[PDB]
Every structure is written in structure tokens, then in C-alpha cells.
Design a protein around this nucleic acid. Structure first.
Ligand code: ZN
Lengths: 47, 52, 121, 52, 134, 38, 74, 123
RNA sequence: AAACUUUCAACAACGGAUCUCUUGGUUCUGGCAUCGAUGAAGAACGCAGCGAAAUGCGAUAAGUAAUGUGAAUUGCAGAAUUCCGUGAAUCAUCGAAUCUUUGAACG
RNA sequence: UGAGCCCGGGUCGAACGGCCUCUAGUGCAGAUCUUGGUGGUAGUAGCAAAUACUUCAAUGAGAACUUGAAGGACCGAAGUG
RNA sequence: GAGACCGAUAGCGCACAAGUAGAGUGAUCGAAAGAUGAAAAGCACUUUGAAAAGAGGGUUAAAUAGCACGUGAAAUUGUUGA
């Protein structure tokens, strides 16, 4: 559904839309992986 | 054109048969004043206009 | 080339217009001649330009002085000759209108004014 | 000044871009555009605990 | 110290007013002391400097050079005195600027206007000398 | 285009006047900090 | 182009369809200003211009808005 | 103020140049090829670089640079022909040769005791 | 052995930190009340001997009158000022004027 | 012990320090920190299509891409007018 | 008129021809940029070079103050020495 675009290469430091023409996009980082792991652990330890 | 014709006659005693005008790109007007055949432009320019 | 304002105040209207005509005629002939040999003639241009301004400011000032004498005892003056002040101060009530009091107030101040007194210690 | 450091229009670019989550000046024709603002760590920003 | 509230002892306000002064105020600032002979003659200590004055330089590298003032350059707060000059590279003689506080006036250019200036200063000195005395 | 008004013509006259560089004698004035036209 | 030269504020912000200036509102008698933008207010407040008349009022207040001519003047 | 201050200017001849629009890396290797050389041999070498007869050995700034047989004189394999750097170094050498002529030194015994290429502000 | 890579020193580069300065800002306090149809605030175009901008001014246009001071302005050129004078000045004060096109804008 | 303190040598040119108290916008390696500057990568990747250029002379410090003349190509009136 | 304030990345965005330059159709957004010297005395003259510039010579107390101008750190670079 959504297209995951990396913040690497020609996509580092872009304020807006990258060159991937899609209706919905999500940009991801290394620093998200720390946060997503923390959010997953908090969900696993509270469910 | 009428004001240039009167000013040349009243001040410098210069008769004109035709006056042409353009506005230069600087925003200033340039007037071409052709004289009557009786007078000479070289005589008037040397006498009054101070031009060789 | 420079006229003196002290000389111009003594002269009358016909002499002032003749001098103004002379300066304009002198400037116009020398403006067609300033196209070449721009030297001390340029100082003559600047002096003549200031001289015309001096004759114009004394022609206008004497005319305004005569009009003020004409309108000395007239109810309405031209708007140029009226004092300027501010817009608020021209719509402010006059000194005689602001100081006007009712005659019942004037009678009370006539017979019972504020007195001068002292209290011992 | 109570308005010192707050006279700018800045928004965070986002959380997915490989840049720090600090508000940045919008625009695009200036040196100031894209620069961090509204922080005690930032040049031309707002210092911590403004003096009252 | 200062007493009156209209006076200011601010350093920046004093420096702003000095370097942004009009030429009329700059004339009073560029004043020079009178010589001992002239001081006992007019009972006047100092006067604003003048184009025709004759001065002697008592401070700087051109000490004891005596000459006539030639220019009062009020823009750079300097006076030009005759023959106190330096040479450029091209062998052209250019004048050296001396502050009026470093010179002493040894002769005055006297007109009717200066004579009122000496008179008005002299009147106040003997006014207080009589006030201090009797 | 080829068709203009005089007021538009005078505005374009002023536009090139700002693009003119500064004169050399301004740089030689005492207390001058101007270097070039901007 | 959707905007032309306004005649009151001099900006190229006069709509060619609505004929209303987006910066000042020229056909309106009042000049457009809003309190949610202090930046826009300081860009057009008094002091941003030349002050032909308002710079001469304080000197005339100091001497009491006096008329006439000093005595003995030529 | 030159870098080599141990050499007195009275017995020496010097010439410098600033903000020269030549590649810094090519000029560094060209100045290293002629360091400590005689004046007339260096001028002949630099002209041969222009005419592609002798080559300048590239030692530090020689990444992915081609090989040639003219580097065998220098004991290397990567050697190039910096024509633009050779033109600038000729004019500076002719300038210092003129400075020695004016001062009265002998041009036949002049060696390049010091030569340095420094980085200029970037355009 | 040289070259290359690395370490230290010296000098020279790149760069603009530190130090010192400040006609600026920030905050507090005190005296006073003063925009405009007699055309405001703002916008434009012109004006200097040699000026683009900032500044000043408005075809009397880097300004006129009047008053005061009392001999300059200055980057250059040129006059000045007879200097024992209605009197220099990019001077100050300021009670008289001039005041282009618009803009509440008003054939 | 240590955070640090003090002196010698060079540079530089206008203000600075010890001691006891008072006061604070007071001590940094990190924050994908802010601003500014600088590297390796690296003299590396690369500097396209529109077929095509050549000879003599002139100018100039310097001429493949500046000019004149002469050869060879092209737009082909729905033009590269 | 003042300050137990800040001292050019600080203090107002603006110590400077700053709401300027620039960006956007527009509402609007909006910088960077201070310091030679006491005095320009800001290199006469000679020489090389097409020129830019360089070397002599000169100004200054100081050219280790050349309007790429006070002091001139580190990153990074060059030459020489080990
Ligand atoms: Zn408008």
C-alpha cells in the first residue's frame, strides 16, 4: 500500500516528496529502528 | 510640439518649418527642429548655439 | 552673479519682475552655451539658479504681506494665510468660548470666592 | 526581550529524514532557510530560561 | 561630580556627540590656549581657532615649529599650519594635521567679531574675581 | 513588448540607473565604507 | 499572470479578476492589516517611509505653534 | 615573508605568485620534479613537458593515473604531462632569473634551493 | 637508499577562534502630549559640476527667506571674502515660503 | 594524587591579576545537536544525440571552437528563411 | 537619565546603503556582513613580465599592519629537519 523510502543516497535531507511518485510514502531511518524496537518492547511487555 | 516652436521663436529667434519629437529611453524628450530654407543651420549653431 | 536678499527687500514689484526676467533670460542664453566649456560657467549656473529662487521668495513674501493687510479687518481669510497649527487645535474651542460660564456660576464666584487664609501652629 | 528568538516561522521537517528533529526555517531563497531555530542549542535561537 | 539631571556621564553618548558634531559645535571643540603674553593682555585663556591665527606646536614630533594656520579641517578635527608638512612618495608636499589642543596661539587674527569674543570672556573673569574678592 | 506606456518606459529607465557602478571619488571620501554597487 | 501592479502600496499584488489587492486592499478605503502578523505590521507602519509632514510637527510643538515673525527682521 | 628564512635575500633571487588558477595537485608534483635542480636544466625540462618529451612523476596525487615509459627515468610508472603547471612554473623561473640579472648574480650557477606550492582560497 | 604512509618540530598556507574595542541592542526610571480634506501614514518619479545606494529636498528641487554664530566646505575642479563684511558654512536655530504624480483621494 | 597553578623562549600591542566576601546566561565527546570551516573518496566518476571537418593568410602575448578566401557537408519554402 | 545586562554565532531579524539582498502567483518568508595605521604617509623611481603581478628601492615605531589589511587557534595542506 504505502511505499517505504530510505533516507539514504539522494534522499538524505529532503524536506518533502522524494522522486518516488506514489500516493502515500513513509520515510525511515536508523533512528526509527531504536524507537520502533522500544515501542514493540513496551507493547510486548504490556500485553 | 507647439510649445517647442514658440520657445525657439520667442527666445532664440529661430523659425522652424517642422518639429519632430521622440522620448529617449532615459525618459527625456528629444526634439528635431527643421528650419526655414532662408536661414542656415551652420550660421545659427556657430552664432547662438556655440557649436562648431 | 549672486543677488543679495538685502537689496531685494528695498525694491518694488516692477523692479523685481524686471530682475527676475533678466535672470531667466541670462540663464536661458547661458544654458544653450553651457554645452561646451563647462568650467567657471557652471558656478554661474548655480549662482543664477539660487538668485531666481531668492527673487521668487521675495516676490511671494511681499504679496502675502499685502494680502494680510487687506484681510486685517475681514472675517474670512484665505486658507494659506490662516494659522496652520494641528487639525485638533483648529477644532478646539476658542479661549472665549472655553472660559464662558453661566451667570449663576458667575454670581457665586463674585460673592463667595476662594479666600486666602493661614492656620497657626 | 520576551520575543527574542521567537520572531521566526519554523517547523520540524519530520522523523524519517536523516536530519535532527529541530524546527527549521521555511523558505528557500536565503541562507536562513532550513536552519535550526527555537532552541538554546541553536544560533539565533532562544536561550534556556529567559531572564525576567 | 555632576549634579544637574540634564547632564549625562554616559561614555557612548559623549562619544556619539563628539564624532557626530555639527561644524558649529566642532569650532568650539577645536580651541587652543593663548600664549602667556596674550593671557596677561586680554585676561583670556583659550579661544576657538581661526584661519589667520599664528600658532606654535608644543606637543608631537613637530614640537617648537612656529607658523601661520592655513586650514581648519573641522571634518578630521585638525588644523594645518604653514611649513609643517611631510612629503608623499611622489615628492609632493602634503600637510600634516595637528590637533588644536597641541598648539598655543601666539598671534591672533583680529576683527570686530574676535574683539567681542575677548571682551565677553574677559568680562566674566573679572566678575567672579570681584565676587571672590569682595 | 513593442507597445508600452511612458510611465512603464520611465520605470525601466530608472531600473538600469541602479545597476550603474559607484564613482571612484566616493571611495576617496573620508569616512567611506562603500566598495561597490549591490 | 494572476497579479498586477497595485497603485497604493506599489507591490505586484493586485488580482486581475477580483481587482482587489492582496497586500493592502486598494479599493477599500482602509489599508489591510491584521494582528496575527506583527511582521506585516512593522513592514508598513509609520517610519517605513519618508515622513514629509509628521517629522515637522514636533519642532512646532516645542515653540508653542507660534505665528508671525521675529521682531526687527528684514 | 618567504618560508625559507635561512637564505639571505642579498645572495639569492626569489619570485612568488598568489591566487594562481592552476590545479594545486599537478603543480605540487611539477615543483617536486624540479626541486634542487639547476636553473637551465629545469627550464629545459618544463618545456619538454609542454612538448610531451619528458614526463613529471606523480607520486602522491597519482590515483588511477596511467602508466608510461618516460617514468623510467624517475624510477616510477605513473607519470603525466602537466602543461598548465609547466607554463606557470616557467614564468616564475624566468622572473627569478631576471631578478638575479638585476642584482648581478650569475645565472649559470643558480639552483632551486626552495620551492613550495601552497593551497589558495577556493573559488 | 629514494619514493609512499605515519609521528614531532620550524616556517609558510587554509580558516576566522581567542583577546581587546564598540556612534548598537536590552531593561528600568523621569518630564511632556504633538498626525490628517489648510490633504496624513504609505507608494512613485525627479533634483548635486563630477552619485549608484542610504540621506535631504520638490521644477525656488543635497534646497529659498528670517534669526543666531562668526570664517569656512573639502575626494577633485572652480569661484569665493576684498578680510574690517548685511557676512563663508554639507553650521545651528526656525515664527516666512516653494511644495511634481498617487494615496482617506475628491471633475 | 588530580582538576589545575606558576616560570623560561618566540609573536603581539592596551589593558590585567592575587586575596576575603557577593552574584550568575559559569565548566561538554557524544544529543541522526546548531552555525561556520575543513578532509579522504579523487585529479576519480564524468565533460551525451543532432553524421564533419580540412588548407592558406590576417589579428593577437597566446587561435580546433576569431576573421577573410578556398574545398567538403547540411536546412530544402510543412526551412536551420 | 541610568544598569552587579549582552559584547559581532552574543544583544532586537537588523552595531554595516536591513525588513536590505534573495524566494514565492500571492498571503508572506527573510539572511550573511564591524576593527590597517597616531597620521594614507595607501609603494616615488628602477627592473622582469601581454597582463595580473613579482623583485629591488621607499613610507612607518612596525609591509612580522599591502585597503585578500589589529591579534591570527584548531581541523586540513606544503617545504625543510629527524
Ligand atoms: Zn496594494
Amino acid at each position: 500500500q504505502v511505499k517505504v523510502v530510505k533516507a539514504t543516497g539522494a534522499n538524505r535531507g529532503i524536506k518533502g516528496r522524494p522522486k518516488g511518485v506514489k500516493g502515500r510514502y513513509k520515510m525511515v531511518d536508523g533512528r526509527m529502528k531504536k524507537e520502533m524496537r522500544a515501542l514493540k518492547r513496551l507493547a510486548k511487555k504490556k500485553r | 510640439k507647439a510649445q517647442i516652436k514658440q520657445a525657439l521663436k520667442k527666445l532664440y529667434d529661430i523659425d522652424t518649418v517642422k518639429i519632430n519629437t521622440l522620448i529617449r529611453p532615459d525618459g527625456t524628450k528629444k526634439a528635431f527642429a527643421r528650419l526655414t530654407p532662408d536661414v542656415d543651420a551652420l550660421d545659427i549653431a556657430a552664432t547662438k548655439l556655440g557649436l562648431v | 552673479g549672486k543677488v543679495k536678499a538685502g537689496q531685494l527687500w528695498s525694491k518694488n514689484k516692477e523692479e523685481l519682475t524686471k530682475i527676475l526676467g533678466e535672470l531667466k533670460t541670462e540663464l536661458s542664453q547661458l544654458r544653450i552655451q553651457k554645452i561646451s566649456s563647462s568650467g567657471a560657467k557652471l558656478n554661474k549656473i548655480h549662482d543664477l539658479r539660487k538668485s531666481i529662487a531668492r527673487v521668487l521668495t521675495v516676490i511671494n513674501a511681499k504679496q502675502r504681506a499685502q494680502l494680510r493687510l487687506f484681510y486685517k479687518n475681514k472675517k474670512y481669510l484665505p486658507l494659506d494665510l490662516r494659522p496652520k497649527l494641528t487639525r485638533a487645535l483648529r477644532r478646539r474651542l476658542s479661549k472665549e468660548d472655553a472660559s464662558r460660564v453661566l451667570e449663576k456660576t458667575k454670581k457665586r464666584l463674585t460673592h463667595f470666592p476662594q479666600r486666602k487664609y493661614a492656620v497657626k501652629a | 526581550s520576551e520575543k527574542a528568538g521567537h520572531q521566526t516561522s519554523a517547523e520540524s521537517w519530520g522523523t524519517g529524514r536523516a536530519v535532527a528533529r529541530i524546527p527549521r526555517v521555511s523558505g528557500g531563497g536565503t541562507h536562513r532557510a532550513g536552519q535550526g531555530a527555537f532552541g538554546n542549542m541553536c544560533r539565533s535561537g532562544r536561550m534556556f530560561a529567559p531572564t525576567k | 561630580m555632576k549634579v544637574r539631571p540634564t547632564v549625562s556621564s554616559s561614555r557612548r553618548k559623549a562619544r556619539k556627540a563628539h564624532f557626530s558634531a555639527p561644524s558649529s559645535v566642532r569650532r568650539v571643540i577645536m580651541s587652543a590656549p593663548l600664549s602667556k603674553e596674550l593671557r596677561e593682555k586680554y585676561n583670556v585663556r583659550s579661544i576657538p581657532i581661526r584661519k589667520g591665527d599664528e600658532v606654535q606646536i608644543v606637543r608631537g614630533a613637530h614640537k617648537d615649529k612656529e607658523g601661520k594656520v592655513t586650514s581648519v579641517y573641522r571634518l578630521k578635527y585638525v588644523i594645518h599650519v604653514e611649513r609643517v608638512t611631510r612629503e608623499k612618495a611622489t615628492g609632493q608636499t602634503v600637510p600634516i594635521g595637528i590637533h588644536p589642543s597641541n598648539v598655543v596661539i601666539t598671534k591672533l587674527h583680529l576683527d570686530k567679531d574676535r574683539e567681542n569674543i575677548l571682551a565677553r570672556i574677559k568680562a566674566g573673569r573679572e566678575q567672579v574675581a570681584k565676587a571672590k574678592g569682595k | 513588448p513593442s507597445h508600452k506606456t511612458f510611465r512603464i518606459k520611465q520605470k525601466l529607465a530608472k531600473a538600469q540607473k541602479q545597476n550603474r557602478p559607484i564613482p571612484q571619488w566616493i571611495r576617496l571620501r573620508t569616512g567611506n565604507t562603500i566598495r561597490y554597487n549591490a | 499572470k494572476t497579479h498586477g501592479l497595485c497603485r497604493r502600496c506599489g507591490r505586484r499584488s493586485l488580482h486581475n479578476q477580483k481587482k482587489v489587492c492582496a497586500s493592502c486592499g486598494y479599493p477599500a478605503a482602509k489599508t489591510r492589516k491584521y494582528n496575527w502578523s506583527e511582521k506585516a505590521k512593522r513592514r508598513k507602519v509609520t517610519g517605513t517611509g519618508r515622513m514629509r509632514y509628521l517629522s515637522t510637527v514636533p519642532r512646532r510643538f516645542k515653540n508653542g505653534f507660534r505665528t508671525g515673525v521675529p521682531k526687527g527682521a528684514r | 615573508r618567504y618560508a625559507a628564512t635561512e637564505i639571505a635575500p642579498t645572495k639569492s633571487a626569489r619570485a612568488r605568485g598568489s591566487y594562481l588558477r592552476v590545479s594545486f595537485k599537478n603543480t605540487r608534483e611539477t615543483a617536486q620534479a624540479i626541486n634542487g635542480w639547476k636553473l637551465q636544466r629545469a627550464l629545459t625540462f618544463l618545456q619538454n613537458v609542454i612538448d610531451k618529451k619528458e614526463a613529471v612523476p606523480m607520486r602522491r596525487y597519482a590515483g588511477s593515473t596511467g602508466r608510461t615509459a618516460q617514468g623510467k627515468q624517475w624510477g616510477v610508472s605513473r607519470a603525466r604531462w602537466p602543461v598548465k603547471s609547466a607554463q606557470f612554473l616557467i614564468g616564475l623561473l624566468k622572473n627569478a632569473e631576471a631578478n638575479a640579472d638585476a642584482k648581478g648574480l650569475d645565472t649559470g650557477n643558480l639552483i632551486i634551493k626552495h620551492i613550495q606550492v601552497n593551497q589558495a582560497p577556493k573559488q
